[PDB]
Design a protein around this ligand. Sequence first.
Ligand SMILES: O=C1Cc2cc(C(=O)N[C@H]3C[C@H]4CC[C@@H](C3)N4S(=O)(=O)N3CCC(NCc4ccccc4)CC3)c(Cl)cc2N1
Ligand SMILES: C[S@@+](CC[C@H](N)C(=O)[O-])C[C@H]1O[C@@H](n2cnc3c(N)ncnc32)[C@H](O)[C@@H]1O
Ligand SMILES: [Zn+2]
Ligand SMILES: [Zn+2]
Ligand SMILES: [Zn+2]
Length: 423
Amino acid sequence: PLKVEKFATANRGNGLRAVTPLRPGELLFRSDPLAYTVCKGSRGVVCDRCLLGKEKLMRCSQCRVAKYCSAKCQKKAWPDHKRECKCLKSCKPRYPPDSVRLLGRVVFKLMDGAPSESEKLYSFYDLESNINKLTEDKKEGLRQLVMTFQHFMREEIQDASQLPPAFDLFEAFAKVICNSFTICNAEMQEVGVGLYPSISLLNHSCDPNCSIVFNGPHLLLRAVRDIEVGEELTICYLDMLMTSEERRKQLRDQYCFECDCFRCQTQDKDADMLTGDEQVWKEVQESLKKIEELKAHWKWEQVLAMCQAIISSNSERLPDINIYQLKVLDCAMDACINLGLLEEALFYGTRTMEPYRIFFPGSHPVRGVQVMKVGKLQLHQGMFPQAMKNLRLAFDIMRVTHGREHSLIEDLILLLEECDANI
Ligand SMILES: O=C1Cc2cc(C(=O)N[C@H]3C[C@H]4CC[C@@H](C3)N4S(=O)(=O)N3CCC(NCc4ccccc4)CC3)c(Cl)cc2N1
Ligand SMILES: C[S@@+](CC[C@H](N)C(=O)[O-])C[C@H]1O[C@@H](n2cnc3c(N)ncnc32)[C@H](O)[C@@H]1O
Ligand SMILES: [Zn+2]
Ligand SMILES: [Zn+2]
Ligand SMILES: [Zn+2]
């Protein structure tokens, strides 16, 4: 019994809107991907199927590229892995761009698979391609991806008959660039990339009324505000820790539109995001490219060493409300968590709390997770008043953003029961 419907918007293509009134935290839609895969940096670190980290993964012996937490996941992934296996084998030791592997899985799913539930409201066929808006160098990039695909698929796909009817590879890559979801794990690390075509109906806002959250590859779409019958549903395509200029560029480059929202009109919060010595935060911005690369490959010790040279720099420092400092602090926290340095993690974690309160207003899944992490760190150092405060806060946010259908909630519920014992 669906609470949402596709409709044609006035000036931003198709969209999704409420059929009934919606309360904050209400579950609107849930979906497995049409197709999905591990990100290049998380390959060999998380299970290809369920996208969880394990220190020891089993590999597919044919290709030795697909790896798995367990026999269960490896056997169940086989149907959707079969045909890419060969392609991946012959490609070695060089690995295709994530978008190519993803499209491969799309083409196999469409050709070999039953009709997907992910396409109930909107199919891959319907996805926006923005073809008449692409720049020539973006076009050039798509043509390279098309030829990369043909090379990668030379064995499994020789001609048009093995693609769907009237399938155009250029058009399909155009779809993939602006309809690919970055799948994040429970701790909000980017772990994979997928297509969820029904979810791709939702248009963008820098102040959205809905939210999406991932439980492995399974995506949950929830309302994070009150929403009236006939009102457009929106999610934020972007990281909240971006300036309007940074949002402008990515929404142009990747999604081919100009955002007309209040926040973009007023440069909302931009000034506060860029406080401190300009010179210092440009070096830190520079350095974050390297830091974020190390983090995507889970190289925690190096992430932390780089972060500590900024946070505890002998030279001039930034305020924690500065978004580049903030990012550096979050990376540091997470590095310390995974290296088992729980004291240092907590120092950093606590310092992110006020800026997150400001930058993730209402109910945002990323703040809820950050608060849980800080609450969790406190709990396991004996700070039971403070910990209980944050865990209840995390629950207040995540009951809206995650909901009882997400298993991280059950983990928090147990943490709440536990911390409740002391009092
Ligand atoms: O048709 C489509 C295709 C598509 C893609 C996306 C999408 O993938 N968005 C990204 C993933 C998530 C959700 C929004 C934003 C960008 N992120 S995030 O920022 O919430 N996310 C990824 C980055 C993480 N880390 C932030 C960080 C970076 C660097 C240092 C410290 C922290 C936190 C979780 C979204 Cl939201 C909608 C959508 N509709
Ligand atoms: C994932 S889709 C959203 C659904 C899309 N509108 C459609 O018709 O299929 C992304 C595309 O929708 C359009 N879009 C999304 N949010 C928008 C906004 N706030 N303003 C204008 N266009 C937007 C852009 O063309 C963008 O590339
Ligand atoms: Zn698994
Ligand atoms: Zn294989
Ligand atoms: Zn905007």
